[PDB]
Amino acid sequence: SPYLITGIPKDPKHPLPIRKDIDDWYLEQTSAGSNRIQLTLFVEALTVIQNRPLNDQLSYFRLAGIHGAPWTEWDGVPGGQKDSKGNPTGFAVHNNYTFPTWHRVYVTLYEQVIYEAMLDFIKQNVPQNGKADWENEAKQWRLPYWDFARFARHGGDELRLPILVTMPMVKVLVPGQPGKQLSKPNPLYRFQMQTLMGTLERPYAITSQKTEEHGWSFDLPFDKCQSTTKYGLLENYNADVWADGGQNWLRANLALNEHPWYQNLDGWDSVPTLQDMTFRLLTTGGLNWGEFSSTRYDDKKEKNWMNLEAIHNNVHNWVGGFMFSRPGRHDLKLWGAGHMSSVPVAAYDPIFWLHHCNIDRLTAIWQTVNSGSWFNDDKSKVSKDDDLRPFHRFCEKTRKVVFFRSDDVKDWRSLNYDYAITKDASRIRKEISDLYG
Amino acid sequence: GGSPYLITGIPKDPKHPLPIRKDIDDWYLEQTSAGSNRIQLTLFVEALTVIQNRPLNDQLSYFRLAGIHGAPWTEWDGVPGGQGNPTGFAVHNNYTFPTWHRVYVTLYEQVIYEAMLDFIKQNVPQNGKADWENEAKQWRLPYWDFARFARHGDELRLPILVTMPMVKVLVPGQPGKQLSKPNPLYRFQMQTLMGTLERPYAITSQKTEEHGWSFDLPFDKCQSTTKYGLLENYNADVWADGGQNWLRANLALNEHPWYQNLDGWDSVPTLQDMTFRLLTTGGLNWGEFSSTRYDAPKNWMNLEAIHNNVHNWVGGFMFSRPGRHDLKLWGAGHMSSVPVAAYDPIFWLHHCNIDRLTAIWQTVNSGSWFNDDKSKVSKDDDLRPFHRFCEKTRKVVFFRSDDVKDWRSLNYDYAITKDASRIRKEISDLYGQ
Ligand SMILES: [Cu+2]
Ligand SMILES: [Cu+2]
Ligand SMILES: [Cu+2]
Ligand SMILES: [Cu+2]
Structure with a gap:
């Protein structure tokens, strides 16, 4: 501490590697041969990160803890923040125009920590003769994305959770034994602690979390979970079920394709699918940064398109399950x-x-198709210079440790990753139509 | 060694008269309450884990016991398999459906009891063995009451325990010490995909018909059993373990999508009401009650047909996208x-x-047993592959339906039948609308 976030370091041999679609990547890794080095690196690194203890701020639990509960310090930056309801809240920015930029840095932190663990895995497990090959793959690896708006391929018509997210076990390579493979618990399937999360040592215990459903309050029993769950917590079920309610991925896929938007869409031209809503987000002209980036711009919506944060909120609900009380x-x-x-x-x-x-x-x-639209409308300009706590960086112009600011990550390529779709500005509008139109 | 495995039920101890098979939710909730010693739950979990981990050449392994029913259609207890559509020992669509399965469930219960006794000998402090043995002697295989609304501190549900990936058991001799272990009731899995097991045990794909089309259900591609997890056009690596999608099973039980045509019925009954009608409709013979073979009646469904629907609703019956x-x-x-x-x-x-x-x-229809024109012909079928000792000729023979007419001869009962005076009131309390 401080943990200086840079993105994966630049290697002349590996110019701006791309974050791939996780289904494409999984099939590349597994379909056309056992080309599984990146899959092995990601599984083995994330497993190590998830097994680090609470006093290691680069453990999975503590990295996830930056966002929200249990609302503690991270990297020397104190917790104790409150949200609009006066309740304890995390460092994450929601309902402000820095929502995309805070999360840009957060995702890069996770990616960087994983890459660093991959290098340790290679130094510890790959024989000399394999180091350059394994190192090359780690340096090319970037965190894959889940394209929640793209129809899943058949060997498609349906949006789906990632293939790999729905697999309890995953097959990895044994370095030092070419040809040998092992099936291991998949660290992308779920995360669990070794006890119920409500009983972790202070100050890390996860409490129940009060939520409104149909205008009434419910205390979601996350203190009674050992494992994360998708849809597995139901009111008036035995708490031994809540300890691990399962990865109920069929219900998440049903919700993605039924798209039960929580917002009032009365008066809309139509009720769009998730793919169409995403298409409209990317192609509706004449929008500013404030309107694109956050639910804050127009309180009342919470014109035939929906902002990035609102879409993102619905996808959170549809993946996780949003009804504890029986409907x-x-x-x-x-x-x-x-x-x-x-x-x-x-x-x-x-x-x-x-x-x-x-x-x-x-x-x-x-950003690519709306150049110049960046914290410069009348509403979002005030937030432009907010410190994106708790994320530290080294400033080269001043030689100081400072917090990230949104302008630091306007060009995501400065964090040494890119997306295929943003490589060629001549192709992007066509690709958006191909994927989401 | 040329030793048939006699199916007898758990042996009789005069100080354990006709122990009851309990509702699995009531039993689990009791076992996990502070007023229980938790020993029966520990015994069931530990014993069934041992049985599931026995090798394929052990005919009392879980795999081989499940194999009696159907695929991979091998021998069991020296009775040949490989019975031109392949088929197993299980009786379906005949009037011995209930009696064949009565023996089968008793075999399972007896093997578990025997593994409990082994566990006690090897793991329990000497001074605790008597107590643990007495709990084993009280234990009987719990039943899942698929027609009873679940306790909620109106919905039919899979058992609590079936929906838990892990379960906590006692460490014998260590009060307060519990350990969380994989729950053997949650699923069964082999160490490889089931379609690659050593011959002759490989589980193949299995044909099914959906909307007039044949599909191969990819059970050869599964390492674990699944509820609803096999969908067409999903990567086969998902099929290896498709999950225990218990919310979808619960939805199916409460939406009750009967496979039968219900044209002209007075109502579409729920699963509870269909079960109520099965138990309370008078004037039916054994053949009408016992099997789909008899046929159709309306506003009533036979035992085997209700059972078939429940199988579909628990496992998931639509591979291709509907x-x-x-x-x-x-x-x-x-x-x-x-x-x-x-x-x-x-x-x-x-x-x-x-x-x-x-x-x-049987209790409320005591005159109806394999004695209508139709079912009488099946009465004396051998219920292969199950062997019993005949206490007259001193020989081992196959079970026959009449041997198990009185289920108490197999040394178990149900609370609801033990208290026969109350039975009609209990049926109304549990299942009446
Ligand atoms: Cu967030
Ligand atoms: Cu989010
Ligand atoms: Cu059967
Ligand atoms: Cu059955």
């Missing part, structure tokens, strides 16, 4: 609650980061 | 496919309740 009979098919729908605990679910990797990509796409 | 309105129930899994349903540990709990329903119906 009416006509809505029983989507009953259940889980981590991704609750801001205080969403970052514990490993899909959180893949979702935010695509939110970062959507931001980069929109 | 229409918009049915997407909420999309997905296929073991319990809907006869050749592989017995691998899912809930199979046995479902069949325990089908045995209980049979016992209840």
Whole structure:
């Protein structure tokens, strides 16, 4: 501490490596041969990170803890912040125009920590004769994104959670034994502690989290979970079920394709699918940064398009499960609650980061086709210079440790990653239409 | 060694008269309450774990016991398999459906009891063995009451314990010490995909028909049993372990999408009401009650047909993508496919309740046993592969239906049939609308 966030260091041999679609990447790794070095690196590194203890601020628990509960210090920056309701809240920015830029830095922190763990894995497990090859793959690797708006391919018609997120086990290579493979628990499937999260040592215990459903208050029992869950917490179920409510990925996929938007869409031209809503986000002209970036711009919406943060909020609900209390009979098919729908605990679910990797990509796409729209309308200009706590960087012009600011990450390529879709500005509008139109 | 495995039920101890098979939710909630010693839950979990980890050449391994029902259609207890469509020992669509399965459930219960006794000998402090043995002697295979609304501190549900990936058990001799272990009731898995097991045990894909088209359900591509986790056009690495999608099973039980045509019925009954009608409709013979073979009647369904629907609703019965309105129930899994349903540990709990329903119906229809024109012909079929000792000729023979007419001869009962005076009131309390 401080942990200086840079993105993966620049290697002349590896100019601006790309964050790939995680389904494309999984099939590249597994389909056409056992080309599984990056998959092995990612699984083994994330496993190590998840098994680090609470007193290591680069453990998975503590990195996820930056976002929300248990609302503690990170990297020497104190907790104790409050939200608009006066409740304890995390460092994460929601309902402000820095929502995309705070999360841009957060995703880069996760990616960097993973890369550093990959290098340690290679130094510890790859024989001399394999080091350059394994190192080359780590240097090319970037955090994959989940394209929640792209139809899943068949070997498609359906939006889906990532293939790899739905697999309890994953097959990895044994370095030093070419040809040998092992099946291991998949660290992208879920995250769990070794006890119920409500009983962790102080100050890290996860409390229940109060949420409103149909205008009434419910205390979502995240203190009673050992594992993250998608849809597995239901009111008036035995708490031994809540300890690990499962990865109910079929219900998440149903919700993605039924797209039950929480906003009032009365008066809209149509009720768009998630793909169409995403298409409209990327192609609606004449929008400013404030309107694109946040639910703050127009309180009342919470004109036939929806901002980035609002879309993102719905996808959180649809992945995690947003109904703890039993609904009416006509809505029983989507009953259940889980981590991704609750801001205080969403970052514990490993899909959180893949979702935010695509939110970062959507931001980069929109920036590409809306050059100059950046914290400069009358509403968003005040936030431009906010410190993006708790994220530290080394300033080269002043030789100081400072917090990140939004202008530091306007060009995502300064963090040494890119997206295929943003490589060629002549192609981007066509690619948006191909994927989402 | 040329030693047939006699199926007797748990042996009789005069100080343990006719122990009862309990509702698995009541039993689990009792076992996990502070007023319980938790020993039966520990014993069941530890014993069933041992049984699941026995090797394939052990005919009392979980895999081989489940294999009696259907695929991979091998021998068991020296009785040849490989029975031109391949088929297993299980009786379906005949009037011995309930009695074949009565013996099968007893075999499972008895093997578990014997593994409990082994566990006690090897793991329990000497001074505790008597107490643990007495708990084993009280234990009987719990039933899943698929027609009873779950306790909620009106919804039918899979058992609590079936929906838990992990379960906490006692460490013998260490009060307060519990340890969390993989729950053997949650699923069954092998150490490789089931389609690659050593010959002759490999589990193949299995045909099914959906909307007039044949599909291969990819059970050969599964390492674990699944509920709803097999969907067409999903990467086969998902199929390795498609998950225990218990919310979708619960939805199916409460939406009750019967496979039968219900044209001209007075109402579409819920699963609870159909079960109520099974137990309370008078004037039916054994053949009408016992099997789909008899046929159809309206406003009533026979035991085997209710049981078939429950199999579908638990396992998932739609591999290929259905229409918009049915997407909420999309997905296929073991319990809907006869050749592989017995691998899912809930199979046995479902069949325990089908045995209980049979016992209840027998109690209130005591004159109807294999003695209508249709079912009489099946009465003396050998219930292969199950062996018993005949206490007259001093020989081992195959079970026959009449041997198990009185389920108490196998040294178990149900609370609801033990208290026969109350039975009609209890049926109304549990299942009446
Ligand atoms: Cu956030
Ligand atoms: Cu988010
Ligand atoms: Cu059967
Ligand atoms: Cu059955």
